[PDB]
From a paper:
Herein, the Fab domains of the anti-gQ1 Mab KH-1 and those of the anti-gH Mab OHV-3 were prepared by papain digestion, and the crystal structures were determined.
An HHV-6B-specific neutralizing Mab for gQ1 named KH-1 was analyzed in detail. The Fab domain of anti-gQ1 Mab KH-1 presented a positively charged area at the cleft between the heavy chain and light chain, including a total of eight positively charged residues (blue). The amount of hCD134-hFcHis bound on the tetramer was decreased as the concentration of anti-gQ1 Mab KH-1 increased, indicating that anti-gQ1 Mab KH-1 competed with hCD134-hFcHis for binding to the tetramer. The single-particle analysis of the tetramer/anti-gQ1 Mab KH-1 Fab complex clearly unveiled extra density at one end of the elongated shape in the 2D averages, and this was also apparent in the reconstituted 3D density with 51,607 particles at 17.6 Å resolution, further extending the elongated long axis of the tetramer. The size and shape of the extra density at the tip of the Palm area was consistent with that of the Fab, and the crystal structure shown in Fig 3A could be well-fitted. It is noteworthy that the tetramer has a critical residue (Glu127) in the gQ1 for the binding to hCD134, and the Lys79 residue in hCD134 is indispensable for the interaction, implying a contribution of electrostatic interaction.
Author numbering:
A (entry chain B): 1 to 29, 31 to 94, 96 to 212
B (entry chain A): 1 to 52, 52A, 53 to 72, 72A, 72B, 72C, 73 to 100, 100A, ...
The structure:
Amino acid sequence: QIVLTQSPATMSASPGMKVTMTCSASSSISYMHWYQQKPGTSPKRWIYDTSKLASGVPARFSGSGSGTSYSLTISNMESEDAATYYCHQRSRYHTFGGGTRLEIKRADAAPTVSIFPPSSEQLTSGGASVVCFLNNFYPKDINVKWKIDGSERQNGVLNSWTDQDSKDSTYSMSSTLTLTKDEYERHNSYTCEATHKTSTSPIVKSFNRN
Amino acid sequence: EVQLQQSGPELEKPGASVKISCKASGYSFTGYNMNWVKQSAGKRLEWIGNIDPYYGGASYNQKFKGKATLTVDKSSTTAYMQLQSLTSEDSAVYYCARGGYGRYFDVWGAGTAVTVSVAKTTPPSVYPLAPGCGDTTGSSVTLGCLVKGYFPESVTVTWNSGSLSSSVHTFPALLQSGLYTMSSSVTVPSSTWPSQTVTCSVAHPASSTTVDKKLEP
């Protein structure tokens, strides 16, 4: 029943910075517990009974809070602290927050955008995927719009995002518009249009079949 | 020490059932409640329910009543969760976790992947992603491979037998209508492609498939 809210869902910080993330409950609770999770791994008990550190948790971590408001703090962030942190309470039921992922802060970076027509191989199968890569951008927030002959196309689009990169801390994204071969061949112009905070104009990347 | 060993990945069709296990070791089995937690790909933790191995009582998140059934087996100190009438909503990783004092979860299993699909093992179609005519206007060129319609996970995509790794991005697969699709990109200087050959090598162990696709201008 008790709803736990973690905001923001993504938090940026640099090694050395103090970090504080918050979990708030829809009704007063007695304790908060916290788990750390990294891609490919299970959650790990991190802080429990509001302020107790699990064995093996660095002392730079601390927990606090009371009533409807609780927090997990890192005194001085390390790189290895980039991870998702979930709060957890039990009253009538066990409930979890939505998680806050701590990411490595870096300078903004505009995406490199590439667009690809359907291969002849795919076309012989009656299908047609148009693919757009938007690579090495920061921050992660980005919007991609597909246009066919200048008109926005919303169905048939699938999007995939990489995890933050180990080496340059950027994000990348793949977007695919899948059509039938007959529908694809009926139009001339295909456009991948991206909006990202690094520019007030949409990035336009197109090809014309003719 | 204390360990929870979970059973391996499950692949089942819609409407079927699956029973996954969580073998506990290193402690007095009846002294702790066992909890089960769902995590859909890239999403939050969700509590399913728990079971007391001493008296046998189980408690459920109301959302999973009629979906999940919890049991224990004291002959093998194992906790079980059965998921019935599977739908695509049930594809997730499932964790068992030991509760302490009814409060926190102090030991977690490694998780069991469950994937719901009507598809049997199916090899990928591998499609080259080359820019259209006139697209390469500058100093770099990005190429890709679209790996489509395979089941189950996973595939690997390697560029020029691993020589080009520093500029490679691998995009997580998506499940649609029971089959997976993923893509991979690589960027090289435009002075080296298409003047030189670039090949993506796609391996799909489950179907014994290896596909080498040359990127053509």
